[PDB]
Each structure stands twice: as structure tokens, then as C-alpha cells.
Amino acid sequence: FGSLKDEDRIFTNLYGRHDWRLKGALRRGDWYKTKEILLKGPDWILGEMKTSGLRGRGGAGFPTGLKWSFMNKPSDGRPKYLVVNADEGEPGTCKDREIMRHDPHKLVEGCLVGGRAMGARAAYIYIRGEFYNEASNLQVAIREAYEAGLIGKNACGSDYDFDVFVVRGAGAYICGEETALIESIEGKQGKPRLKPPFPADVGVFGCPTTVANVETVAVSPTICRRGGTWFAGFGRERNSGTKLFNISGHVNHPCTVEEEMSVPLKELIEKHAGGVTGGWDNLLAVIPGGSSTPLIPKSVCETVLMDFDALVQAQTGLGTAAVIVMDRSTDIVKAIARLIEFYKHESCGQCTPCREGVDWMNKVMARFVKGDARPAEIDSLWEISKQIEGHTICALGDGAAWPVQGLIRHFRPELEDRMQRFAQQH
Amino acid sequence: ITHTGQVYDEKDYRRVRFVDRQKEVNENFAIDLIAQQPVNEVEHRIIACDGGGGALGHPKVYINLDKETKTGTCGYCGLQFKQ
Amino acid sequence: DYNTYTFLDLNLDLSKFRLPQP
Amino acid sequence: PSGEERCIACKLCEAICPAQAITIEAEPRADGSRRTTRYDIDMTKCIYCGFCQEACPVDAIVEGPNFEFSTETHEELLYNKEKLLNNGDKWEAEIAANIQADYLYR
Amino acid sequence: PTTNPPTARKFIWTNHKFNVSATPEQYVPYSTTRKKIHEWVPPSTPY
Amino acid sequence: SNLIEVFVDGQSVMVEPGTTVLQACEKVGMQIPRFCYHERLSVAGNCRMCLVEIEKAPKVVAACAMPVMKGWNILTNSEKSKKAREGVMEFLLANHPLDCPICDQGGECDLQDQSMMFGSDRSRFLEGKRAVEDKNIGPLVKTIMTRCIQCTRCIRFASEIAGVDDLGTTGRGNDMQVGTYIEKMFMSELSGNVIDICPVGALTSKPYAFTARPWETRKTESIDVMDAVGSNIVVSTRTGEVMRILPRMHEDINEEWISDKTR
Amino acid sequence: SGVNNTKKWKMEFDTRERWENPLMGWASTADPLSNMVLTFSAKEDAIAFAEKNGWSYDVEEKKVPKPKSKSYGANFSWNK
Amino acid sequence: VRPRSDVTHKQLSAFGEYVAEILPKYVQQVQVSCLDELEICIHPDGVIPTLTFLRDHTNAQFKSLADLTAVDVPTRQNRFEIVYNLL
Amino acid sequence: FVHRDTPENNPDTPFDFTPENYKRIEAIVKNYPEGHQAAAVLPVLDLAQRQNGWLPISAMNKVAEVLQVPPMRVYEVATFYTMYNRKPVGKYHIQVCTTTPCMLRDSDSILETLQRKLGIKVGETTPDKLFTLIEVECLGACVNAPMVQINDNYYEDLTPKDIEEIIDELKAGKVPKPGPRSGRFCCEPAGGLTSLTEPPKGPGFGVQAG
């Protein structure tokens, strides 16, 4: 439904307004039951995650509990590890920039709460290098915490020993990928690996590893504190909890606000954030989960709401839940065209289908904006799109195909007219 | 003599073949004729040499004129292009 | 306001806290 | 037109000749270009199928219009690169007109 | 040819010849490839 | 023991646990079209030209890199696994420079044939192609690298079979060029093998640049005499003079490789 | 990397003189059985052809690539 | 892709069985190609008998011999494969 | 992506970490597991850039030695990621975000403003080498859509004029109040908090027993 209470919200420091430093955090009481929780043991913590129903919170929303659980298997003499990706690259995502900058601590105890759940020896946080200032904030926060003894040996009074590190990203969206974050951490080129050697099995430095969206790590301590039920109650069925929503582009007050997941879309922009610029009638389309997810046109939108189950019914992905809105004042053919330009300037090129395919769609898309290309080419790009969708080594090729598929699926008449417009003036 | 320096030695007997006959050779040698054509100063990093005449020419190929020092040469025409 | 070495130098300061290596 | 012989010694004219007539051996010319050191069409072996005309990518080897090349001696009929290149220079104007007329069809 | 003159390409002949077969100008076939197995020439200096 | 039974199109082959999907097809006798996978080189998964369709599975799997699992049926020739090849070959060819009558790996191309056998008959890439500046990697290997399908077998061999660790990928996107960042020649023995191992004719042999074309070469199997390892080799002779000596596989002596001296 | 030409056994006669031709430089051969390579499906059948036709034979055992263990995980080994 | 009628692949198939049944002493294999062509295979001793039945049987009159040929599979013990095509 | 040795950009340019920098490099190595120094390539390479913006081929070579990694590896990392300059770069090095979110909120205007403000075209740098204009991709901070990253700072939610003001500040003086120069605090609802209006909660609240 929606309308989460501020009291039941998780990052009270969102929008700042409270010292992102420890003191403000102590008034927040973020480090309240940390020793106790870890004392409970890895299993109990992971269990709470399952009860929570917390899905990914990052890109694909895999059940968090089960995922983390995959490394709750006995150590084989290799130190297990925690990797917390804070790349936050998906266009439209400033979701994570908040927790890191505004509430660094929540993530610090998220790390150790999560750490004992997987029995990780240590956690490395890969904040995108672009955010240099952001990094300045977290290690100040990390430094505070150890000074306190909250982390490190004798973590918060626990025999558990966990060390948290921050790693510099270098302006790559793909670094974000789970197998590629690792390789950047490993120091090689940021190129994803194949899934058959799964991340838990082969870890960073060949030591079991797990990767979580920073939001996913951050909520785990509060969910254990509030209990899985409290959390699981807010969401709809499988889709559960309240996910932060970042609305950017063609909305009166673009902002990131956390609301009950499964909140109706027509409502999200209506209640928080602000009204669609030019009236709700001025809504050509919206991309619910960021650039990777397909945009949904206005008639479908209010009907549907923001939860992953509802969106997959709608053929779109909740993803990072970044709402980008396009008024009737925008050349979508060019809007999506720059996202394909966003992906040609960024895919690693390791795999044949993404390398040439994304460049091929970029060339066709640029011609489509001009209208130089003939109408028959439009379904040609359909077929190029699915060749890339199922054949890619990672998901980015998955992601490049979806916006192209959305433009053809709902805005096929407009592209034909741009086709027609150029043919007429000759 | 010929394009490839094919010159029967002073003692070879195939020279008997040329006795009382003309050893056919062509004055117009390609190695030289291509040189005359000047380097085309294109203003795009990659240009294409369709071979001149499209279907009546050679398979289309794109040349990278990025190397500032050297000039791109179509593996087909031999035509050279520089940026 | 932060300096170009804030991240690195701060980290070095944290080295002492950093738990022993693997 | 510049004056560079069209053949680039891909040697598939040799591959598709039905009679084994064309013999080609090549080496990189000093310019660095690919060219044929020896191109020998044995016309007595050739059965004038016209596939070589078909096969060439640069269309360097063409079936020229002249049919009157009867020769007193058998050796004259064997043709090396210099005779064919000379044959090409002599009939280039008509060959160009003929290819001009029929290329749309091909 | 008068009405639509042909294309001139600065290699094409200006004097075209008839059958030169009985006349000395005739093609005499020859291999145009250079030597393949060069040989060790004996040292001219007496050992 | 240690013998899973996997079905390749219902042939119930049995393989040691660990065998890849491509390997399972090999023992039945089927051959997954493959680029970037060499038996004695690490699996990389770069090309994704080997996508096959295990039965009852949503997506197609990477043959060369997927540990086979019990029960799986490979469906190598499934309508799907043919679209998964008819559509990859579309991409490799799209940025490819068509100078096949320059590429002396004319008949020795694992990309035309895998295109003539497993790919489509036409093209839809009405857009423009790319071009990559060539490199003088050495005096033996001619790298006309605008041909490269970024299959990373060179970077592997140059690191795994030979310990050169010089060749590497540089950049991202469609201008990832696999050439030495600074122009340092690839000087090492075992160097010429890159020619034989690059299925594309991007980098090929400079001495044997354009002297021949493979269908003509008569191939006689003989023994290396330059060194005492006695590596097996095939001497390719045309009209009676040797044109090339390339390795032929001997498990024990030279397993598909030969020295820079003896070729 | 295709292996479809390493399947059937072939028996090939010994190579003989290939002298250069004086007039055109074409290769010339005096051995009739040179270009003949017969293809036989199995080693036993090929040996039979040599015996009844009276040609001497020296069979070479097929050498097939030995199984090689590969797994993408290895390349990311803690210590290789 | 060529048009194929299965009427023939059925008619010819049946006939094959008919011939086989009538001449079981010699017919070893009887197949119909995907090209709708029947190819009874007979032991060499059945040359006279199988042909005669086809030349003079009301339900199978095969009056003219289109061709007699012999492929040579050197691998095959019996080198030649005499093939008789009848109409 | 090819380093054709040039007198300026080639190893004749000697590179060596200042004594202090080497100390920093050591800590960086400590974070990673022992026996895995190679993992510190990115961090160390960055430090080199901090030392010298150009990050010349010589620098790349030094990084390799310091981390005992093959030289090529350093090259791959440098030529793969984008935050590494691999050339000389302007003192200010402004980067303008032009992904669809920003563009939808009129990013193009900002770029145009800069082009003439700077007098230099994108992909190019000012004569004084004070400012280098680059059309970079999503830099995060999308909510404050109109946004650009001058050097390390993130100036956000900027209207064309604002930048001119900022650029002037950069041109004369320093530290031009880096951050969103609009009333909105960070990424809050511009008009008014749609939530988080009430005071934050307290320790132990609604906590399940233990």
C-alpha cells in the first residue's frame, strides 16, 4: 500500500539533519544490540534475513537470506570475506550515495552484523572513486568506530574479529558487477567472470566471498533489531520491507525518500518527491528501476505499483528503484539513445554479444533519432536486442537490451513517424 | 627487367627463346604507378576505400589513419590516405 | 573541504587499528 | 585507373578454375603490397568457362572480348602475367565498357 | 566510339597491335618468378 | 565411481565430474562451434559462440565453461542453440574488415567456416565498421589487428604456455585492442605459435605473408631436426619447395607447439 | 581448431621428383601415384588394400588428444 | 527448401516391403531415400531372381534398365557396389 | 589506446613516489591479504596521479615495480578505467554529467555554458591549462540532476549561471563553496520533507528481546 511512518523508517539521518558522525548515530542508537546479535551467532542472523524476506536491494533482488546463506557452509581453510559494493553506477541512483555520505555508521554495523552472519574475516567497501568526498566521510566514521572498539579485534565486546576497509573505484559502471567488483578488488582489469565458479565458491583471492548492495548490508542490523516480522510486514508478499525510492527527472521535487515497497507508482511521485512536471497528464514514460530496466508508458504506470513482483508482471524491473520520469517534452528516441551511448562508453568488451551488439544498437539508435533509418530497421533492432539479452557473460548486455525493447514495445508508432519525417523532406 | 626483376642470366638458355623474338614486358609498372597518386588527406580517423566505382571496384574496407606518422594504405588499391 | 591524500593518509592512520593480515 | 594492377593474389581464381589452367605464386612486393610474382593462364588448358571472371573479388581477371588470338606455335598460347597485363592494357577501354554494361546483372 | 568516346586511364595503349605471331614481336612464354634455391658458390680464394 | 552420466542429445555419455559441457559433446563426437577455447589454454568465455541449450533450462549455457551436471541433455542443435550462433556470428562479422583475399588465413579460418557452417547467409550491419591501428609486434608475426575478434587466446598463450606476460587487453568497449600498450616486440621462443593459435588472421606470419594459400599446400608429416626434443611438425610444400612448417600434435613430445627456430 | 579432417584414415604413396619445367617454370612430376590418396574408414581395411595390391605399408597409430581437465574456477586460485 | 510429398515415401516404402516379402532369400536391406527413391539391396546371387521378378510381375512391371553402374568403395571388403536403376 | 613515446610523455620523465607517498603506498598494500600486493594497483596508480596528474608511461612503470606486477597489468588497468588521465590534465578538470537523468533536467545547457565560458570546446583544455572540459557520464548525484564534477568536488543542482559564477570563483581565488548551490539540502524533497519530518528514534526502540 504505502505511507510508511517516519518512525518506522530506517535511515533517520537521510537528508542529513542529524550528525552523520557517531554521536548523532548514538542518539540514533544504531549500535545498540550489536554485541548481542553477533553473540547470537551466524545462523540466527541469517535466519532473520530469511524471515525478513529481504530481497537484493541492489540490482537483481535475489533473496538476500539465501544468498548470504550460501557462504554459511564450513570454512575450507580459506578466510571468508565480505564485499559491500557501493559503486552506485546505475544511472539514476543516488540511493546509496545517501547512506554512505549521510549515515556511514549504519553501514559499518551493517558490515559486522552481516559479517558474523557469513563468518567473514573482513569486509572491503568499494565506493566509486568518483565519490572522493564520500570516501572521506566513511573512513572518518570507520576510524571512529574502531577507536570505540566497535569494530576490529574484540569487536563491540565480541570475540568476533572483523576489519572493515574502503577500496577506491575508478569510474566504471561495470566495476559494480558482482564478479567484476572482485577483480577490481583483486587488482586486475574490471572484467566479470562466468557464474559456474560461483562467487562464494571462488572468492576474492580464492577465498569465499559475498557481495551486497550497501542498502542490503545497512538494513540487516536494524532488521535484526526490529525483527524480521516488523520488516517483512511492510512489503507485499514476496516483495517485502521498505525500499528507498529515488525519483529524478520531470518531477516537481526530485528526492530520495524511503517508502513501503509495493507503493503505487502514480502515488510515489504524488505523495513524496513531487508532482509530475506539467501535471500527471504530462507523463510520456517512466523507467522504474533506472536505465537497465525497461521504461513503462503512462497508461500502465499508476495501475502498477513499485514492488519487484508487480514490475516483473509489468515486464519491467524494480532494480535500484530509481524513478526517471519523462514528460511529453522529451525525445525518447534520443533519451534511450544516450543510455545506449551510456553502455557503449562503458561495457568491458570481454564478451562478443555485448561488445559489437551494444555498439551496433548505438549506431542504429543514432540513425533512429535522426530518422534516417527506414521503418523495417526498427524490428531488426528488436532481433539484435534479444541476441544480446540471453547470450551475454554478465547482465549489462541484459540491461542494454531492455530499454531498446521498451522503446519498440510502447513507442513503435513515434519512431516510425521519425522514420517518415526524414523520408518526406528528402 | 620485368616487374619482379625477372632477368634470365647471361648464360641461361631460355634466352634462346628470345632469340629472334620479343621478350614481352610492360613499361607500365605498378610499383611505380601507384606512387604517383598522392596521399589523400581525409579528415576522419577512419575512412573507407570502396575501391572506386563501388560494385565495379574492390571489396570495401575501412582504414585507420590514426597513426600520425604513417599513412593508411588500402590493401587493395594501394591508395594512401592521411588524416 | 578535504585534501587529495585524505583517503590514503586517513587510511594509514587506521592501519594501526587494522587487524592483523591473513 | 591509377596504374596499380588489380590482382591481389588471393588465388581463388586458381581454386575455381575447372581445368587447372591458372598457376599463381606470390610474395609481398617491395612496397609491401600483395602481388603475384607469376600468373600463368594456359589457354590450351583453359576451356573459357568464365568462372574466373565470376570468382575474382577485385575482378582483376576478366573475360576480354577478343576471340581472334590464333597462334602459329603452342608456346605462344601459354600466357604469363606480362602478356595478360598487356592484353589488359590493349583492351581495357572495351573491357571497361563491357563490365559497365553487365555489372548490374551480376 | 566517336559518339561516346571511351575512358582514358593513362596506361592504356595508343598504338594497338594486330596478331604479331609470325612477326618477331610475338609472345615467347617465360617464367617470371625469380630463382628459388640459391646455391653456395665455391670460395674463389685458394685455401 | 566419479562417473556422472550426462546425456548429449540422449546418448548417456558418462564423464568424470568436472568435465565441461563442450567436453561432454566431444566424447559423443559432436563439436560445439568455439572461439577463445583452446584445449591447452585456460577457459575464458570471451566469444560466447559456444552457447548451447541444456534441456529444461531457461537460458543457454556456455559450453566451454559450464561444469556438466547429472542428467543434463545438451540439445546442441536445438533451434535455440542455432539462434544463439546465428546471432553471435552476426556480431563477430559486423565489426570484421572483409579482406579475406588479403587474410592469408583464407582457408585456415575458424571464423569463415564456423560462419559457413553454423552462421547466417547475409548481413544486417548497415552501419559503419571500426579500424584498429596495426602494430609492429615483431619481425615474425604480422599483426594486421583490425582482424582481432578479442578472443584473448593470445593473451593466454603469451602468459600461460610461454611466460612472456606481455600481450594484454587495453581499454574497454568496442575499441578494446589486444596489443602491447607500449611498442615492445614480442621476443621469445614459442613466439610463432600465436600465429597458429589466433583463429583469425589478424596476426599471422610475416615471412609466409603471401607466398601461398592453404588449399594448394601439400602436407607431409615429418620430424623437427633443429633441436633434440624432436618435435613433430608438418612441412607444407607447394609445387616442390617448402612454404611453411607448422606444428602437428604429439602428446608426449611437442603438444601442438614448435620453436621459433624450427618454423 | 576443427577436427573433422582427423577422422578417417588415409594411405598416401611416397612422394617423388617434382623438377621445374624449363619453358614456364611450372612444377613437373614423373610419378603417376603421387596425387592419389585413398581414404579408408578403419586401420584394418587400409592394411588389407596394401597387401592385395602389393604396395609396402608402414601404419602409424592414431594419436588422439588426451583428456585434459579444465575448470574456469582454477584461474582464480588463491595460490596457483 | 524443396517440396516433398510423403505420398511417395509411403507408396515406395510399401512396395519395398512387398518386394522384400516376395524375394526374402536375397533382399538384405530396402530403404527409401529422403528423396523418395527406393533402393532394394540384394545379395549378389539374387541378381537374376530379383530383376526377373521386377521385369515380369503384374504388380511391379520394371521393363527398362535405366543404368548399371559400380561405385567403388575401397574400404568396403566387397569393393564394387553394382547399382541397377530400373524404370 | 597506444602510447607512441613522445619527449614529454615517455620514461625520460623520471617518476618516483615522494618519500611520504611511499609510506602511503605501504599502508595500501597492508589492507590487502599478504601475498596479494598486486591488488593494490588501482589504489597506488591513483596515488601516482595525485602526485602527477599526467600519470605518464613512466609512472605506470613505477607502479608496476612498486607492486612487483607485470608492466602490462598496470597498463591494462590504466587504459581500462577512466578516472586515470594518461595525459596532461587541467588544474581544475571540470567534468559535466550528460547521462539521460541530467540531460532530462537540461544538462546540455550547462555544457554549452561552459564551452564558451571556458572558451574551450569539450575534449579540450584552456590555453593556461587551468580548465579541462570533459563530457563524463553518470557521476552519481543524479537527484541533483544538473551537476558537474570539478576536480574532486561535486558541484550539484546548478543552473547555467551558477557555474559561470563557480568558474569565476575558480578563475580568481579558490575553494568556491563546492556542493549543491541551491537551497535544497542534499537530496531532500526540494519543497519540503515528504517524510523524516519528525525527530529521529531512540536506542532500543521496538527491539525484539535480545
Ligand SMILES: Cc1cc2nc3c(=O)[nH]c(=O)nc-3n(C[C@H](O)[C@H](O)[C@H](O)COP(=O)(O)O)c2cc1C
Ligand atoms: C553492469 C552492472 C552494474 C551493476 N552496478 C551495481 C551497483 O552500482 N550497485 C549495486 O549494488 N549493484 C550493482 N550491480 C549488481 C551486482 O552485480 C550484484 O548483483 C549486486 O550488487 C548484489 O547485491 P544484493 O545481493 O544486495 O542485490 C550491477 C550489475 C551489473 C550487471
Ligand code: SF4
Ligand atoms: S585474379 Fe582476381 S582472383 Fe585470381 S588472384 Fe588476382 S585477384 Fe584474386
Ligand code: SF4
Ligand atoms: S579472418 Fe581473414 S579470412 Fe577469416 S574472415 Fe576475417 S578476413 Fe576473411
Ligand code: SF4
Ligand atoms: S590476436 Fe588472435 S588471438 Fe589474440 S585476441 Fe585477437 S584474435 Fe584472439
Ligand code: FES
Ligand atoms: S568457446 Fe565457449 S566461450 Fe568462447
Ligand code: FES
Ligand atoms: S546521470 Fe548525471 S548524475 Fe547520474
Ligand SMILES: [Zn+2]
Ligand atoms: Zn583502395
